[PDB]
Each structure stands twice: as C-alpha cells, then as structure tokens.
Amino acid sequence: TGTTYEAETGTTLTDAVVETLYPGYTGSGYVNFNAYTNSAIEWNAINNMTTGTKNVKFRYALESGTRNLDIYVNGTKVLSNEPFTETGSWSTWGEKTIQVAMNSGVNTLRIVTTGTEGPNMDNITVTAS
Ligand SMILES: O=C(O)[C@H]1O[C@@H](O)[C@H](O)[C@@H](O)[C@@H]1O
Ligand SMILES: O=C(O)[C@H]1O[C@H](O)[C@H](O)[C@@H](O)[C@@H]1O
Ligand SMILES: [Ca+2]
Ligand SMILES: [Ca+2]
C-alpha cells in the first residue's frame, strides 16, 4: 500500500497555491501551479524503510494537453521534462507512475514547471518497486 503524501500540506509551494475548486481530491485540496516555468511543489518528508527504486504515483487532473515537469530527488534533478498527459477534465483525477531511486529514511522530492505549466496535483503515493 505504501504512503500517500498530500500535495497541499506538508509541502513547500513556489508560485503555486492550494485550490478546492474542482471536486474529487483527497485530503483538504490540491495544488494549482501558477507559473509556466519555475512553479514547484517540494515534499520535505518522504519516509522510506529501504533504499531502492520506488514507484511514485501522482494523482492529478489536466483538462487538455500535455504538461511537463522536472523531477528532483534529494536535490538532484533525476527526470527532465517528464510528461503528464491529459485526463480530459479538471475533475477527472488520473494517475501517473514514475520509477525513481530513493534512499531509506527521510528524502525530499520536488516537481517543477519548465515552460508548459503543470497539472493540478492532488497527492503522491510512494511504494517500493
Ligand atoms: O521502503 C519503501 O520503499 C517503503 O517504505 C514503506 O514503509 C513506506 O510506507 C513506503 O511509502 C515506502 O515506499
Ligand atoms: O490551466 C490551468 O493551469 C488552470 O486552468 C483553470 O484556471 C483551472 O481553473 C485551474 O485549476 C488550472 O490550474
Ligand atoms: Ca495552473
Ligand atoms: Ca490532496
């Protein structure tokens, strides 16, 4: 089952805001990226039992188009312009899973816009791959 970390709480936001306009989110809301570039969500407390490759499953909404995010783990960029494809509606919450290396113990993960803005981001769920 893993751990789910909400996007809206327990994070640091840059040019991004907590929003509740579209229904279906988990927790208290979701995050809306505001800037086409350099908007960010940083999770500061991703807590793993083991070091290894993780499945990081983003729950997100994206009415149309593809939007690409840079993905950092423990301060190092590890995915460049990773695509988030459309869900069809701002209240259609889809899932996208990436496979990235993380350490045991406490880690950080930061996702950043790069020129196409971002999906509305609900949470991430991290499991061992
Ligand atoms: O070590 C791991 O990968 C897993 O550790 C578990 O305890 C966490 O609940 C899960 O989120 C991590 O993916
Ligand atoms: O296209 C976007 O990024 C934005 O479009 C609308 O403003 C929508 O209400 C937002 O939730 C979304 O973030
Ligand atoms: Ca937005
Ligand atoms: Ca949420």
Tab-separated table of all heavy atoms in Angstrom, residues 6 8 26 29 122, ligand 4:
chain	number	residue	atom	x	y	z
A	6	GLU	N	-0.110	14.089	0.706
A	6	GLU	CA	-0.882	15.116	0.019
A	6	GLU	C	0.035	16.181	-0.590
A	6	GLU	O	1.132	16.478	-0.062
A	6	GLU	CB	-1.877	15.770	0.957
A	6	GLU	CG	-2.909	14.858	1.499
A	6	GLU	CD	-3.805	14.295	0.415
A	6	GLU	OE1	-3.854	14.880	-0.691
A	6	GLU	OE2	-4.527	13.360	0.740
A	8	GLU	N	-0.918	19.332	-0.848
A	8	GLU	CA	-1.315	20.666	-0.292
A	8	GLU	C	-0.846	20.895	1.097
A	8	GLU	O	-0.918	22.075	1.543
A	8	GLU	CB	-2.823	20.814	-0.387
A	8	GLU	CG	-3.605	19.830	0.423
A	8	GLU	CD	-3.989	18.511	-0.294
A	8	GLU	OE1	-3.331	18.216	-1.359
A	8	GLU	OE2	-4.868	17.779	0.189
A	26	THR	N	-8.237	14.151	-2.776
A	26	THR	CA	-8.016	13.598	-1.458
A	26	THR	C	-7.499	14.707	-0.532
A	26	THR	O	-6.899	15.699	-0.951
A	26	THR	CB	-7.029	12.436	-1.470
A	26	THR	OG1	-5.705	12.905	-1.775
A	26	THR	CG2	-7.401	11.369	-2.459
A	29	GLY	N	-7.398	19.478	-0.297
A	29	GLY	CA	-7.460	20.190	-1.595
A	29	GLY	C	-6.455	19.627	-2.542
A	29	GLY	O	-6.143	18.443	-2.486
A	122	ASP	N	-2.858	16.428	-6.826
A	122	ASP	CA	-3.619	16.059	-5.622
A	122	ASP	C	-2.732	15.494	-4.494
A	122	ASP	O	-2.803	15.923	-3.356
A	122	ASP	CB	-4.717	15.074	-6.006
A	122	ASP	CG	-5.655	14.751	-4.838
A	122	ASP	OD1	-5.685	15.566	-3.917
A	122	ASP	OD2	-6.361	13.758	-4.949
B	4	CA	CA	-4.903	16.449	-1.947
